[PDB]
Design an enzyme around this catalytic site. Structure first.
Site, PDB file in Angstrom:
ATOM      1  N   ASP A 139       0.832  -1.207   0.000  1.00 46.04           N
ATOM      2  CA  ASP A 139       0.000   0.000   0.000  1.00 46.04           C
ATOM      3  C   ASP A 139       0.867   1.259   0.000  1.00 46.04           C
ATOM      4  OD1 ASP A 139      -2.485   1.479   0.059  1.00 46.04           O
ATOM      5  OD2 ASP A 139      -2.469   1.455   2.270  1.00 46.04           O
ATOM      6  N   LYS A 142       2.556   3.347  -5.855  1.00 45.72           N
ATOM      7  CA  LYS A 142       1.964   2.348  -6.734  1.00 45.72           C
ATOM      8  C   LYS A 142       2.889   1.802  -7.805  1.00 45.72           C
ATOM      9  CE  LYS A 142      -1.232   3.292  -3.973  1.00 45.72           C
ATOM     10  NZ  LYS A 142      -1.063   2.672  -2.617  1.00 45.72           N
ATOM     11  N   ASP A 167      -3.405  -3.115  -2.195  1.00 48.43           N
ATOM     12  CA  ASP A 167      -4.463  -2.088  -2.213  1.00 48.43           C
ATOM     13  C   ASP A 167      -4.382  -1.278  -3.506  1.00 48.43           C
ATOM     14  OD1 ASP A 167      -6.626  -0.510  -1.265  1.00 48.43           O
ATOM     15  OD2 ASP A 167      -5.372   0.964  -0.244  1.00 48.43           O
ATOM     16  N   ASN A 168      -5.486  -0.687  -3.904  1.00 48.88           N
ATOM     17  CA  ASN A 168      -5.471   0.338  -4.959  1.00 48.88           C
ATOM     18  C   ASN A 168      -5.135  -0.219  -6.341  1.00 48.88           C
ATOM     19  OD1 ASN A 168      -4.011   2.143  -2.356  1.00 48.88           O
ATOM     20  ND2 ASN A 168      -6.063   2.665  -3.098  1.00 48.88           N
ATOM     21  N   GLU A 197     -11.566   4.244  -0.168  1.00 56.85           N
ATOM     22  CA  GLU A 197     -11.795   4.741   1.164  1.00 56.85           C
ATOM     23  C   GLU A 197     -12.584   6.055   1.200  1.00 56.85           C
ATOM     24  OE1 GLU A 197      -8.721   3.857  -0.173  1.00 56.85           O
ATOM     25  OE2 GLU A 197      -7.166   5.332   0.355  1.00 56.85           O
TER      26      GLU A 197
HETATM   27  C1  LIG Z   1      10.034   4.050  -2.446  1.00 62.27           C
HETATM   28  C2  LIG Z   1       9.074   2.870  -2.270  1.00 62.27           C
HETATM   29  N1  LIG Z   1       9.272   2.292  -0.918  1.00 62.27           N
HETATM   30  C3  LIG Z   1       8.619   2.751   0.247  1.00 62.27           C
HETATM   31  N2  LIG Z   1       9.075   2.267   1.400  1.00 62.27           N
HETATM   32  C4  LIG Z   1       8.509   2.649   2.565  1.00 62.27           C
HETATM   33  N3  LIG Z   1       7.506   3.518   2.670  1.00 62.27           N
HETATM   34  C5  LIG Z   1       7.063   4.006   1.512  1.00 62.27           C
HETATM   35  C6  LIG Z   1       7.548   3.671   0.272  1.00 62.27           C
HETATM   36  N4  LIG Z   1       6.876   4.339  -0.724  1.00 62.27           N
HETATM   37  C7  LIG Z   1       5.967   5.050  -0.120  1.00 62.27           C
HETATM   38  N5  LIG Z   1       6.032   4.907   1.293  1.00 62.27           N
HETATM   39  C8  LIG Z   1       5.119   5.461   2.302  1.00 62.27           C
HETATM   40  O1  LIG Z   1       3.867   4.748   2.014  1.00 62.27           O
HETATM   41  C9  LIG Z   1       2.765   5.686   2.111  1.00 62.27           C
HETATM   42  C10 LIG Z   1       2.323   6.032   0.713  1.00 62.27           C
HETATM   43  C11 LIG Z   1       1.323   5.416   0.084  1.00 62.27           C
HETATM   44  C12 LIG Z   1       0.881   5.742  -1.330  1.00 62.27           C
HETATM   45  N6  LIG Z   1      -0.596   5.670  -1.350  1.00 62.27           N
HETATM   46  C13 LIG Z   1      -1.308   6.305  -2.319  1.00 62.27           C
HETATM   47  O2  LIG Z   1      -0.753   7.046  -3.145  1.00 62.27           O
HETATM   48  C14 LIG Z   1      -2.754   6.153  -2.316  1.00 62.27           C
HETATM   49  C15 LIG Z   1      -3.467   7.073  -3.061  1.00 62.27           C
HETATM   50  C16 LIG Z   1      -4.861   7.033  -3.128  1.00 62.27           C
HETATM   51  C17 LIG Z   1      -5.608   7.973  -3.970  1.00 62.27           C
HETATM   52  C18 LIG Z   1      -6.764   7.488  -4.641  1.00 62.27           C
HETATM   53  C19 LIG Z   1      -7.539   8.314  -5.462  1.00 62.27           C
HETATM   54  C20 LIG Z   1      -7.117   9.650  -5.591  1.00 62.27           C
HETATM   55  F1  LIG Z   1      -7.881  10.473  -6.376  1.00 62.27           F
HETATM   56  C21 LIG Z   1      -6.009  10.170  -4.923  1.00 62.27           C
HETATM   57  C22 LIG Z   1      -5.240   9.327  -4.104  1.00 62.27           C
HETATM   58  C23 LIG Z   1      -5.545   6.037  -2.431  1.00 62.27           C
HETATM   59  C24 LIG Z   1      -4.823   5.144  -1.634  1.00 62.27           C
HETATM   60  O3  LIG Z   1      -5.444   4.159  -0.925  1.00 62.27           O
HETATM   61  C25 LIG Z   1      -3.442   5.177  -1.592  1.00 62.27           C
HETATM   62  O4  LIG Z   1      -2.767   4.246  -0.850  1.00 62.27           O
HETATM   63  C26 LIG Z   1       3.354   6.933   2.798  1.00 62.27           C
HETATM   64  O5  LIG Z   1       3.310   6.749   4.206  1.00 62.27           O
HETATM   65  C27 LIG Z   1       4.795   6.930   2.229  1.00 62.27           C
HETATM   66  O6  LIG Z   1       5.736   7.647   3.027  1.00 62.27           O
HETATM   67 CL   LIG Z   2     -14.622   3.417   3.687  1.00 64.66          CL
HETATM   68 MG   LIG Z   3      -4.081   2.667  -0.363  1.00 58.23          MG
END
Ligand SMILES: CCNc1ncnc2c1ncn2[C@@H]1O[C@H](/C=C/CNC(=O)c2cc(-c3ccc(F)cc3)cc(O)c2O)[C@@H](O)[C@H]1O
Ligand SMILES: [Cl-]
Ligand SMILES: [Mg+2]
Ligand SMILES: [Cl-]
EC number: 2.1.1.6
Length: 213
Positions: A139, A142, A167-168, A197
């Site tokens: 999650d 992406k 997810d997603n 969500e």
């Molecule tokens: C570099 C890759 N490795 C990683 N290692 C450890 N942590 C990581 C990593 N990447 C990202 N993270 C962390 O994960 C989390 C990021 C998640 C990315 N999630 C999304 O973009 C997301 C985005 C949406 C979304 C859906 C529809 C929209 F219109 C706009 C946004 C819905 C979701 O359920 C999502 O999960 C943050 O806490 C970030 O700091």
């Molecule tokens: Cl929900």
């Molecule tokens: Mg998500």
């Protein structure tokens, strides 16, 4: 002051200490009545619950903790002795996740690993004494689902029957991940259609069970 801090503060002021379900409910209420945030949410959360209950994993890895919602959700359903490792690259969010877990009373079931998945995954065997994982929840960013899946395989962290839950896969979408797990003889896949969500946009989870190499 950040949205993530506001969410934590809302849980701290409203939820019941040591009650993980009340923490999930408080987060959902905040996001329903105030600011949207990218937690897996209630709808997809029900599916996550069902998967955890069905497979009773002893060791789960989560990629991307954010505010700790999914960590709380999964950890609360783990059997005695089972453990969750959650990876989070952003130290502000890692700090929020720890405070969320502490409030939920789940801190002894969960270990937060600070850093990017691509750097932590190769350390799991040596540094963190992992043999193989029973479940992985994806999650995070992406475009990193596919690369990390391949890294997990390469590092020998998956075994026959390891469950990946992503997810997603529809919104925002993980088309390369899906093409890989669905095309590869190494995974047997099930799609779970649900909703994004806190709204009624169709989104879904993919369950991909590793079969061996
Ligand atoms: C570099 C890759 N490795 C990683 N290692 C450890 N942590 C990581 C990593 N990447 C990202 N993270 C962390 O994960 C989390 C990021 C998640 C990315 N999630 C999304 O973009 C997301 C985005 C949406 C979304 C859906 C529809 C929209 F219109 C706009 C946004 C819905 C979701 O359920 C999502 O999960 C943050 O806490 C970030 O700091
Ligand atoms: Cl929900
Ligand atoms: Mg998500
Ligand atoms: Cl099994």
């Amino acid at each position: 002051d950040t949205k993530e801090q506001r969410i934590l503060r809302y849980v701290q002021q409203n939820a019941k200490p040591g009650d993980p379900q009340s923490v999930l409910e408080a987060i959902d209420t905040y996001c329903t009545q105030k600011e949207w945030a990218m937690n897996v949410g209630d709808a997809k959360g029900q599916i996550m619950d069902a998967v955890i209950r069905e497979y009773s994993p002893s060791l789960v890895l989560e990629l991307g903790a954010y505010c700790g919602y999914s960590a709380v959700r999964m950890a609360r359903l783990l059997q005695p002795g089972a453990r969750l490792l959650t990876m989070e690259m952003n130290p502000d969010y890692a700090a929020i996740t720890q405070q969320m877990l502490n409030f939920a009373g789940l801190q002894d079931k969960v270990t937060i690993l600070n850093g990017a998945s691509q750097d932590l995954i190769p350390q799991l065997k040596k540094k963190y004494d992992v043999d193989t994982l029973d479940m992985v929840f994806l999650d995070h960013w992406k475009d990193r689902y596919l690369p990390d899946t391949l890294l997990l395989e390469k590092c020998g962290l998956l075994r026959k029957g390891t469950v990946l839950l992503a997810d997603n896969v529809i919104v925002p979408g993980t088309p390369d991940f899906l093409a890989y797990v669905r095309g590869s003889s190494s995974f047997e896949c099930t799609h779970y259609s649900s909703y994004l969500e806190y709204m009624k946009v169709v989104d879904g989870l993919e369950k991909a069970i590793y079969q061996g190499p």
